[PDB]
Amino acid sequence: AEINVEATSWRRVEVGRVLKLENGSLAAIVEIIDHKRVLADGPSSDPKLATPRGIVPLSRALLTPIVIPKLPRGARTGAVKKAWEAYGVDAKWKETNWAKKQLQQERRQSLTDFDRFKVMRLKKQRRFEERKALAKIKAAA
Amino acid sequence: AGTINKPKKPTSKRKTTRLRAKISKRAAEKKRKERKLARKNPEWRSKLKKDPGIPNLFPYKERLLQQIEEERIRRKEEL
Amino acid sequence: AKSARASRIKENHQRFKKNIAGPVEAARLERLSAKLMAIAQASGVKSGKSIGRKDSSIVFPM
Amino acid sequence: MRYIHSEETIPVPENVKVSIKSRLVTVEGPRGKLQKDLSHIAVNFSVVKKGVIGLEIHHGSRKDVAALRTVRTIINNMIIGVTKGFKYKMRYVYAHFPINVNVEKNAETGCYEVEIRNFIGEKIVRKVVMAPGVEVEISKAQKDELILSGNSLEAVSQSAADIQQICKVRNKDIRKFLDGIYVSEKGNIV
Amino acid sequence: SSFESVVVIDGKGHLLGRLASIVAKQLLSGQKIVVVRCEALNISGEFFRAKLKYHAYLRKMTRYNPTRGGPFHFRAPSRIFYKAVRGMIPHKTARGAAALERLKVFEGVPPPYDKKKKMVVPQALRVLRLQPGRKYCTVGRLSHEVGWKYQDVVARLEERRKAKGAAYYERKKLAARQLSEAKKAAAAKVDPKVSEALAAYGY
Amino acid sequence: PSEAGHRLYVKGRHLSYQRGRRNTHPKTSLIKIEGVDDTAAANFYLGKRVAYVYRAQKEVRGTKIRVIWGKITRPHGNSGVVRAKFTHPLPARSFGASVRIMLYPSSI
Amino acid sequence: MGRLQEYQVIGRHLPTEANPNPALYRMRIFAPNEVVAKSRFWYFLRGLKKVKKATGEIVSVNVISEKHPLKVKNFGIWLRYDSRSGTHNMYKEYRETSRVAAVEAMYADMAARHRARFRSIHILKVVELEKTEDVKRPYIKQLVAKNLSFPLPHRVPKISTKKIFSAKRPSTFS
Amino acid sequence: LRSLTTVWAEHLSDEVKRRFYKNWYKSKKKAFTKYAKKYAENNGASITRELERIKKYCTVVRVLAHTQIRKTPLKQKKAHLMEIQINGGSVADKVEFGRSLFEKPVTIDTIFEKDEMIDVIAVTKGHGFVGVTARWGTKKLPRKTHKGLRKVACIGAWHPSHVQWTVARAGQMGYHHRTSVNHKIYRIGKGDDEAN
RNA sequence: CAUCGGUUCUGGCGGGGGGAUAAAGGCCCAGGGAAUGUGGCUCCUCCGGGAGUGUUAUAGCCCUGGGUGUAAUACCCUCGC
RNA sequence: AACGCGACGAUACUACCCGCACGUUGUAGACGUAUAAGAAUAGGCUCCGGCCUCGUAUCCUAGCAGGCGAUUCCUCCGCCGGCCUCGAAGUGGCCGUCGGUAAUUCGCGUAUUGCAAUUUAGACACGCGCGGGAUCAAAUCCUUUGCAGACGACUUAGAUGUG
């Protein structure tokens, strides 16, 4: 009996699933109300990732691969925080490819005009030498 | 029916002012006539309406009847 | 009576076309084509082998 | 109400191989292979166990949940078709004019064609073409019997229905004129 | 909100009314709009409902003379989209005509729009608007049943265009790969101060 | 040589006048500025000068190009559409015409 | 019907030489504000004890906040509403963290499913289910089940309405 | 369908050259003169390019054929030219067949055969301006009808307040293009046969 | 353009008062309780995980009272820049 | 479609084509007016390592509206010629020549438009000019015809001939 099934695998909301909100804050599920509202708590010490405990809608939230294992259902702020610095959610969130992309976005939006001109000129250095490399690979084959 | 390949004449939903005014006049006459028949109505009506009661699926209904009996006994003792 | 657009009459005509008049028309066709063929037989840029360009618009004029 | 989760199970035999990609179910067995596209129903296919297909639906309605049973039965019918096959046997009876039935296999299509003649003395020849993969044979153990076999239950039963429906008595009393071809027995090849 | 010289929209997977409203607003605002592949356009609801609508539209004609003044029934998918667009535009005004002359609609993707970038409109996409389980129909299929003769010609032209686009796809994949090893090989010869400053700024 | 542009203004499209469903007041015009989508984004451009540039037939004082000038007065609605007041009301033929919103007077 | 705050409204009849200390009456009102709270309290006083606003007065109005707004709770609601047939009972169950949110959701769903407005709905009891065994409706029984974890199929991505044109086809998988 | 190219022969007659002119007696007869030089320059590279183009891009091939009008007793000297489709075979076969048929007379007996049932395309005899009675077969009004009896009494008695397109009116009758079908050929007689 | 005056649109900031001197909640102290049974123990298996026991253990949760606390914050009112 | 389209032949001139020389020439409206897979959305992409809310991206973008001269680099762009190629309303790929070119650094000029006044700058079509290259044509009125016809219109014939 050989079975080859190629299908989809959604990230699944569960107690301990970590959500990213639109403001950059991070939270974790502590209790499931319904399929459109959840109870989430962000105990992170970093203020940018902090989220006050309360109800958030799933439409107002995203899905991250971080899940806190063995997190009790309905755990309060102290227990969720003990699990949070037990698991190191902040470090894994920084290692995820999303937080790099938003951090790169503030590194774009915080630029001065002098910073933009420096970006232009350093990019021109990199593109000149990349065009030289491009000539070497194109000449080889 | 052959409605898909050969449709018939459409039914217009665009109301006319004459029809709207006539319908409004008949409607107001109907409320006035129902008021007159309610005033002249000889059908018997109860002084106290039929109470619907308490739903059976209510989980604390037995507790509510406990408080009902307790309050009735307390009122009887007070009176 | 059945119409000219009747499905049964159309199927009868299709069977007639495939089974009866078909070989007759094919034999006449091949003999006429034989007579007509009998009468008929009785660089890339510089040579024209390569199809080059000859010697209202769909796009917005910009 | 909207159902949070609903699941169904499909057992698979050891000789049957199942491939599911973009809801295109391929079921391969000893007798051949069958293909069926099921992209019109929102269903999650999974491997919950060795030899068990899991059908799942999330946040669906009652009709969407009830479609899973139809999906299960079609998949099980494909499995039964590639494993044991499907066989419909029909009988044809006549009162006075013997029905002359002839079965041939067209080379350029690969499909079977059945010609029926002398149906209540009619001079027309009724030609019915089977679906591909359906084999028609004259039974030799019994009298006036056609046997249709294949891997697709829908195709075999539809060909049997077409053979039954091509011989319809017209403008006569059906209590008196009993002529026709009728599907008698349904089962598996093995 | 971005001003372009001309915006090319693939008609595949779009909804007729919503796409028509959006492009009509763009045309009346002053944006030049070209819509290609109107045969793959979608209308919600079951297909027999659209058949009812088009046959009811076929019923209308001027009684005393059908050659003038009557509703002229254009059977093409692009012309049906043009009628839907025109119904949302004051076409009997000079401004309306000057907006309608900024629109072009086609079946398939005729050249040189085959070598131009095509936009999609999220507010009119079926996968972003319709609920699952709801039926949908094809404007091309409706046109083919009501008398549009050029379904198969557009089909084979789209087949050959897709073959040529596939050829351009392996060329583009080859260029993407050799650019990737070009950047990787050049990365060794990048000045480290340039690397650190560019990484700090965000590239 | 330089391959750069020289644009020091921001583009816009002139939609219509201040109007109801029937009555239209050409004393105030409606503009989309390029890249603005919100009232907060449009709040930057309040008080900025705005110029509409057109061409004529005759040659007066060394130019065949005429400019009508104005300023951005207040936001309109929620989609960043702005209201503009000019020294002369805009032509009605300019519905869909491009307009130049200046960066001055600046408060930066 | 709005941002409902919940009020304890206590009133009484005006003092008289015959009755120097009249009996006090307290009700729990779900109202948009204090004016509607007093108005509905007087309306129910006419309906029950026949005490008028001219002959009575309001002694106390207090805002009752939830003890635990951060705790997910199940609410059972016993209600009477008026339709063209007459008066009807319903028992319904909801899942919210506060009585005010439970009552607002009850209003919204009651209007959506049976076309009842505020003046045609009478709230009799709103009780917090102390145990999960008391839950009766299957759509709340499925939410209070063991280890409930579900996916989110076909989520339309968030695209700004002012972003009219997109350069790629969006995905609906997250 | 859209015509991509046409390929012309090197030598063409004066009777088919007359088809391109209205005042041929005053004309210098310069038609096709520079085109005949394209059969000479570059060994026909241009005409070979059109032949390769027509072999590659097109799917329907039609020869151009003109009738020899000088063999008829008609006073006309300008010939009749049409497009005749080549059916059967591939596009390359059609192009090679047409190129072989250039500057060549094809008789009637190799296109059509005795016992063949064909279609006839022609123009109806003209009658000029004709009234409704002969134009539509309408019933004549009784004798001494006021304002005429070879007419239609009611062109309209009902709404619309217009004359409908289906009401019989007087006008041109005849000189219509007509395509009649199912015409049997009884004989294809030969001109050189003195007993045809 | 700057400084003004009248009318008006918009944005931000610093304080005060009230409610259950908000209600929460965080950290401690003292009690009481249960399973959508944690750890542990027993029994089955596809060895993946299931069934039984119960009061915190190798997770925690609910109720009451007290301290921090005249805490902060939401909401309403209110003084100005 | 008499305000839809294609192919072909002959095209006298002030007609046609090429070069530059500019428009008190006109344009529902240039200012980087840059960017080609197809397909699915209860699934996709790949360099086969992995990746996917996100175009918030990529390319290009510095110099008298962008000069002159070096240092330095072999990068980018454009015009031509050749070979291919592109028919859905036809255009791109490679090679060769030529010309320009801050990727690095430096030197001389910028003023005076006087504290803002469009930054007159692009494309298409049109016209007047020269200096050249190529070509010497048709239609209508008139006479005639009757396969046509109220008149127009239509079928014909009128240049040396089977008139």
Question: Which residue in the block uniquely carries the two structure tokens 């699990």?
Answer: A83
Instruction: Judge whether residue F43 contacts strand I, using its CB and a 7 Å cut-off.
Output: yes
What distance in Å separates the CA atoms of residue G4 and residue H3, rounded to the nearest whole number?
76
Taking alpha carbons only, the member of D85, H181, E30, H159 closest to residue F95 is E30
What distance in Å separates the CA atoms of residue G119 and residue G107, rounded to the nearest whole number?
11
Token duo for residue D43: 């269903």
* Strands A26-32, A37-42: pairing kind: antiparallel
From chain C, pick out residues whose CB is under 8 angstroms from the CB of H113: 28, 31-32
CA distances from A122 to A63, A116, A131, E201 (A): 36, 10, 14, 10
Number of H helices, E strands in chain H: 5, 6
Residue D85 region, left (φ>0) first, then alpha (ψ -120 to 50), else beta? Answer: left
Token duo for residue C4: 């000219």
What distance in Å separates the CA atoms of residue A58 and residue A21, rounded to the nearest whole number?
10
Q: Beginning with the edge strand found earlier in the chain, give each strand of the sheet holding G121-128 in spatial order.
A: G87-96, G73-82, G121-128
Token duo for residue H65: 């054929």
SS3 (DSSP) at F45: coil
Taking each helix axis from N to C end, the angle separating D62-83 and D153-166, rounded to the nearest 10 degrees, works out to 90
A14 and G149 within 8 Å at the Cβ level: the answer is yes
Asked if residue D36 lies in contact with residue D95, where contact means CB atoms within 8 angstroms, the answer is no
Question: Which residue in the block uniquely carries the two structure tokens 């066709």?
Answer: C29
**b (16+ CB within 10 A) / e for E34-58:** bbbbbbbbbbbeebeebbbebeeee
Find which of H52, H56, H93 to mutate to test the C interface (most C CBs within 10 Å of its CB): H52
Backbone torsions φ then ψ of D184, nearest 5 degrees: -105, -55
SS3 (DSSP) at B31: helix
Asked if residue E84 lies in contact with residue E124, where contact means CB atoms within 8 angstroms, the answer is no
Token duo for residue H106: 């094809």
Q: Burial, H24: exposed, middle or buried (Cβ in 10 Å; 0-12, 13-18, 19+)?
A: middle
CA distances from F38 to F28, F77, G161, H1 (A): 20, 9, 11, 52
Question: Which residue in the block uniquely carries the two structure tokens 């609903």?
Answer: D6
Taking alpha carbons only, the member of G118, G136, G119 closest to residue G127 is G136
Token duo for residue E152: 């198969």
What distance in Å separates the CA atoms of residue G74 and residue G134, rounded to the nearest whole number?
10
SS3 (DSSP) at E32: coil
- The count of other CB atoms within 10 Å of the CB of residue H104 is 11
Residues in CB range of H189: below 8 A, 6 or more apart: H196
- In this structure, which amino acid lies at residue D21? K
Instruction: Judge whether residue F44 contacts strand J, using its CB and a 7 Å cut-off.
Output: no
- The count of other CB atoms within 10 Å of the CB of residue C53 is 4
How many alpha carbons lie under 13 Å from residue C17 in its C-beta half-sphere?
A: 6
* Strands A26-32, H61-66: pairing kind: unpaired
Asked if residue F87 lies in contact with residue F49, where contact means CB atoms within 8 angstroms, the answer is no
Measured in angstroms, the CA of H52 and the nearest CA of chain C are apart by 7
Asked if residue E34 lies in contact with residue E141, where contact means CB atoms within 8 angstroms, the answer is no
From chain B, pick out residues whose CB is under 8 angstroms from the CB of G90: 55
Residues in CB range of D167: below 8 A, 6 or more apart: D92, D99, D116, D119, D126, D179, D180, D181
Q: Which residue of C has its CA nearest to E110?
A: C58
Token duo for residue A141: 């084959």
- In this structure, which amino acid lies at residue D117? R
Question: Which residue in the block uniquely carries the two structure tokens 């009993």?
Answer: D178
What distance in Å separates the CA atoms of residue E8 and residue E26, rounded to the nearest whole number?
12
- In this structure, which amino acid lies at residue H33? T
The answer to whether F78 faces chain G, any CB pair under 8 Å, is no
Q: Which residue of E has its CA nearest to G164?
A: E121
Tell me if the bond preceding F105 is cis, omega within 30° of 0: yes
D12 and A8 within 8 Å at the Cβ level: the answer is no
Instruction: Judge whether residue G174 contacts strand J, using its CB and a 7 Å cut-off.
Output: yes
- In this structure, which amino acid lies at residue H15? E
Residues in CB range of E24: below 8 A, 6 or more apart: E85, E88, E89
The answer to whether E127 faces chain D, any CB pair under 8 Å, is no
Instruction: Judge whether residue E94 contacts strand J, using its CB and a 7 Å cut-off.
Output: yes
**Angle E197-E201-F1 (CA atoms, 0-180°, nearest 5)?**
80
Instruction: Judge whether residue A116 contacts strand J, using its CB and a 7 Å cut-off.
Output: no
Token duo for residue A44: 């992170």
What distance in Å separates the CA atoms of residue H95 and residue H62, rounded to the nearest whole number?
9
By C1' distance from the Cα of D51, the closest nucleotide is I46
Backbone torsions φ then ψ of E159, nearest 5 degrees: -65, -45
- The count of other CB atoms within 10 Å of the CB of residue H165 is 13
SS3 (DSSP) at D167: coil
SS3 (DSSP) at E42: strand
What distance in Å separates the CA atoms of residue E31 and residue E3, rounded to the nearest whole number?
7
Asked if residue A29 lies in contact with residue A74, where contact means CB atoms within 8 angstroms, the answer is no
Asked if residue A77 lies in contact with residue A43, where contact means CB atoms within 8 angstroms, the answer is yes
Strand I-contacting residues in G 117-156, CB cut-off 7 angstroms: 131-133, 144-148
Token duo for residue H64: 């151009």
Asked if residue G78 lies in contact with residue G62, where contact means CB atoms within 8 angstroms, the answer is no
What element of type H or E holds D6? strand D3-11
What distance in Å separates the CA atoms of residue H9 and residue D68, rounded to the nearest whole number?
71
- The count of other CB atoms within 10 Å of the CB of residue G132 is 11
CA distances from G4 to G25, G67, G97, G100, H79 (A): 22, 16, 14, 6, 96
Taking alpha carbons only, the member of D131, D117, D187 closest to residue D161 is D131
Residues in CB range of A131: below 8 A, 6 or more apart: none
By C1' distance from the Cα of A86, the closest nucleotide is I59
Residues in CB range of F101: below 8 A, 6 or more apart: F9, F10, F11, F12, F31, F33, F45, F48, F49, F50, F72
List, as own/partner pairs, every contact residues D31-40 make where C-beta atoms lie below 8 angstroms and the sequence separation is at least 24, other chains included. Answer: D31/D81, D31/D82, D31/D83, D31/D84, D31/D85, D31/D151, D31/D189, D32/D82, D32/D133, D32/D151, D33/D82, D34/D78, D34/D81, D34/D82, D34/D151, D34/D152, D36/D74, D36/D78, D38/D71, D38/D74
Backbone torsions φ then ψ of A114, nearest 5 degrees: -65, -40
Find which of G152, G155, G171, G172 to mutate to test the A interface (most A CBs within 10 Å of its CB): G152
What distance in Å separates the CA atoms of residue B55 and residue G87, rounded to the nearest whole number?
13
Transcribe H40-56 into DSSP letters. Answer: TGGGTHHHHHHHHHHHH
CB-nearest to G89 from B49, B52, B60 is B52
SS3 (DSSP) at D180: strand
In whole angstroms, J78 C1' to E128 CA is: 46
Question: Which residue in the block uniquely carries the two structure tokens 């003649």?
Answer: D117
Residues in CB range of H6: below 8 A, 6 or more apart: H64
Backbone torsions φ then ψ of F15, nearest 5 degrees: -85, -65
Distance from chain centroid for Cα E150: 18
Transcribe H103-162 into DSSP letters. Answer: T----STTT--TT-EEEEEEEPPP--EE-HHHHH-PPPPPTT-TT-SSS-S-S-SSSSSS
Residues in CB range of E49: below 8 A, 6 or more apart: E137
The strand ranges marked E within chain A are: 2-6, 18-20, 26-32, 37-42, 51-57
In whole angstroms, J133 C1' to D84 CA is: 87
**Angle B16-B22-B26 (CA atoms, 0-180°, nearest 5)?**
145
Measured in angstroms, the CA of E160 and the nearest CA of chain C are apart by 19
By C1' distance from the Cα of G69, the closest nucleotide is I24
Asked if residue C59 lies in contact with residue E109, where contact means CB atoms within 8 angstroms, the answer is no
**Angle H164-H168-H173 (CA atoms, 0-180°, nearest 5)?**
130
Residue D19 region, left (φ>0) first, then alpha (ψ -120 to 50), else beta? Answer: beta
First to last CA, chain A: 47
Question: Which residue in the block uniquely carries the two structure tokens 């046409």?
Answer: H6
List, as own/partner pairs, every contact residues H108-114 make where C-beta atoms lie below 8 angstroms and the sequence separation is at least 24, other chains included. Answer: H108/H188, H109/C35, H109/H188, H109/H190, H110/C32, H110/C35, H110/C36, H110/C39, H111/C32, H111/C36, H112/C32, H112/H185, H112/H188, H113/C28, H113/C31, H113/C32, H113/H185, H113/H188, H114/H185, H114/H186, H114/H187, H114/H188
Number of H helices, E strands in chain B: 2, 0
By C1' distance from the Cα of G3, the closest nucleotide is I75
Taking alpha carbons only, the member of G142, G105, A9 closest to residue D3 is G142
State this model's resolution in angstroms: 2.9
- The count of other CB atoms within 10 Å of the CB of residue G173 is 14
- The count of other CB atoms within 10 Å of the CB of residue D42 is 16
What distance in Å separates the CA atoms of residue G79 and residue B19, rounded to the nearest whole number?
41
Residues in CB range of H77: below 8 A, 6 or more apart: H14, H15, H18, H69, H70
Q: What is the DSSP letter of C21?
A: I
The answer to whether G85 faces chain B, any CB pair under 8 Å, is no
First to last CA, chain C: 65
List, as own/partner pairs, every contact residues E86-91 make where C-beta atoms lie below 8 angstroms and the sequence separation is at least 24, other chains included. Answer: E87/E20, E88/E20, E88/E21, E88/E24, E89/E24, E89/E27, E89/E28
Asked if residue F11 lies in contact with residue F34, where contact means CB atoms within 8 angstroms, the answer is yes
Instruction: Judge whether residue A82 contacts strand I, using its CB and a 7 Å cut-off.
Output: yes
CA distances from G11 to D112, G40, G52 (A): 92, 12, 11
What distance in Å separates the CA atoms of residue H30 and residue A17, rounded to the nearest whole number?
89
Instruction: Judge whether residue F88 contacts strand J, using its CB and a 7 Å cut-off.
Output: no
Transcribe C29-53 into DSSP letters. Answer: HHHHHHHHHHHHH--HHHHS-S---
In whole angstroms, I51 C1' to G72 CA is: 30
Adjacent-strand bridge partners of B2:
none
What distance in Å separates the CA atoms of residue B2 and residue E80, rounded to the nearest whole number?
24
Q: What is the DSSP letter of F93?
A: G
What distance in Å separates the CA atoms of residue C45 and residue C52, rounded to the nearest whole number?
7
SS3 (DSSP) at H61: strand
Token duo for residue H111: 């296109």
Asked if residue E148 lies in contact with residue E77, where contact means CB atoms within 8 angstroms, the answer is yes
SS3 (DSSP) at E139: helix
If contacts are CB pairs under 8 Å, which of residues 26-45 in chain C contact chain H? 28, 31-33, 35-37, 39-41
Token duo for residue A71: 């997190």
The answer to whether B6 faces chain E, any CB pair under 8 Å, is yes
Helices (H), E33-186: 47-59, 77-86, 94-100, 126-129, 139-146, 151-186
Transcribe D61-103 into DSSP letters. Answer: -HHHHHHHHHHHHHHHHHHHHHHT-EEEEEEEE-SSS--EEEE
Torsion on CA atoms F36, F42, F48, F50, rounded to nearest 10: 50
Torsion on CA atoms D67, D68, D70, D76, rounded to nearest 10: 170
Distance from chain centroid for Cα A123: 27
**Angle D117-D121-D127 (CA atoms, 0-180°, nearest 5)?**
25
Measured in angstroms, the CA of G96 and the nearest CA of chain B are apart by 18
Asked if residue F68 lies in contact with residue F88, where contact means CB atoms within 8 angstroms, the answer is yes
SS3 (DSSP) at E156: helix
Residues in CB range of F56: below 8 A, 6 or more apart: F64, F65, F66
First to last CA, chain E: 25
SS (H, E, C) chain G: CCCCEEEEEEEEECCCCCCCCCCEEEEEEEECCHHHHHHHHHHHHHHHCCCCCCCEEEEEEEECCCCCCCCCEEEEEEEEEECCCCEEEEEEEEEECCHHHHHHHHHHHHHHHHCCCHHHEEEEEEEECCCHHHCCCHHHHCCCCCCCCECCCCECCCCCCCCCCECCCCCCEC
Adjacent-strand bridge partners of H130:
H171
The answer to whether F30 faces chain E, any CB pair under 8 Å, is no
Taking alpha carbons only, the member of D81, D132, D78 closest to residue D109 is D132
SS3 (DSSP) at D36: strand
From chain G, pick out residues whose CB is under 8 angstroms from the CB of F37: 160, 162
Asked if residue H90 lies in contact with residue H98, where contact means CB atoms within 8 angstroms, the answer is no
Residues in CB range of F102: below 8 A, 6 or more apart: F9, F48, F49, F50, F51
- In this structure, which amino acid lies at residue G26? R
Taking alpha carbons only, the member of A13, A32, A24, A12 closest to residue A48 is A24
